Amino acid sequence: MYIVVVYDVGVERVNKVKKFLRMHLNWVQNSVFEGEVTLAEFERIKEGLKKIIDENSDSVIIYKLRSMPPRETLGIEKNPIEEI
Amino acid sequence: MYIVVVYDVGVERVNKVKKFLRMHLNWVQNSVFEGEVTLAEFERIKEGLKKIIDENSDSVIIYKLRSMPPRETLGIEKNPIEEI
Ligand SMILES: [Cl-]
Ligand SMILES: [Cl-]
Ligand SMILES: [Cl-]
Ligand SMILES: [Cl-]
């Protein structure tokens, strides 16, 4: 899979999700990560995120894609496509 | 195209982007919208968003997909898949 991960997390866990996702996926916007993973990394990422998360005040959408998607970007880009 | 739109916008324009996107796309998480559009709607959405946006403090990624992507969701879901 290639995933894009976008989350809405409270200030008490938001620093934790960022540090965790940044060791599996590329950071491209605030609250948004993407990259290639395997089913190992995937459910590692996924449960790894559930442990971190209060599933009762917090939301993660992980879009499960074939491959890296084309995109378009308005405004202050934070991570040039090349770097991802 | 089918797009997922995720944005990071300052409090002075954040209410405007939401109201605008909500008339083209489905709201599924804070700062995240998705749905089917046409090239009319697309560049309508896209410039429509640039007018709203300070491209100098703000970011929009519009992922350009074939079709609606599969996904998985942790925690408080805000819009059951059926509704989108
Ligand atoms: Cl990163
Ligand atoms: Cl890929
Ligand atoms: Cl909506
Ligand atoms: Cl579709």
From Swiss-Prot, chains A, B:
Cofactor(s) this protein requires: Mg(2+)
* Gene Ontology terms, MF aspect: metal ion binding; RNA endonuclease activity
Q: Name one Pfam family in it.
A: CRISPR_Cas2
EC number(s) given by UniProt: 3.1.-.-
Keyword Magnesium present in the record's keywords: the answer is yes
Q: Which GO terms describe its biological process?
A: defense response to virus; maintenance of CRISPR repeat elements
Highest taxon listed in the record's lineage:
Archaea
Which residues of the sequence carry a binding annotation for Mg(2+)? 8
Q: State the UniProt keywords alphabetically.
A: Antiviral defense, Endonuclease, Hydrolase, Magnesium, Metal-binding, Nuclease
Protein family membership: Belongs to the CRISPR-associated endoribonuclease Cas2 protein family.
Function comment:
CRISPR (clustered regularly interspaced short palindromic repeat), is an adaptive immune system that provides protection against mobile genetic elements (viruses, transposable elements and conjugative plasmids). CRISPR clusters contain sequences complementary to antecedent mobile elements and target invading nucleic acids. CRISPR clusters are transcribed and processed into CRISPR RNA (crRNA). Functions as a ssRNA-specific endoribonuclease. Involved in the integration of spacer DNA into the CRISPR cassette.
Give the multimer and partner information. Answer: Homodimer, forms a heterotetramer with a Cas1 homodimer.
Q: Which NCBIfam families match?
A: cas2
Protein name in the entry: CRISPR-associated endoribonuclease Cas2
| Organism whose genome encodes this protein | Pyrococcus furiosus (strain ATCC 43587 / DSM 3638 / JCM 8422 / Vc1)
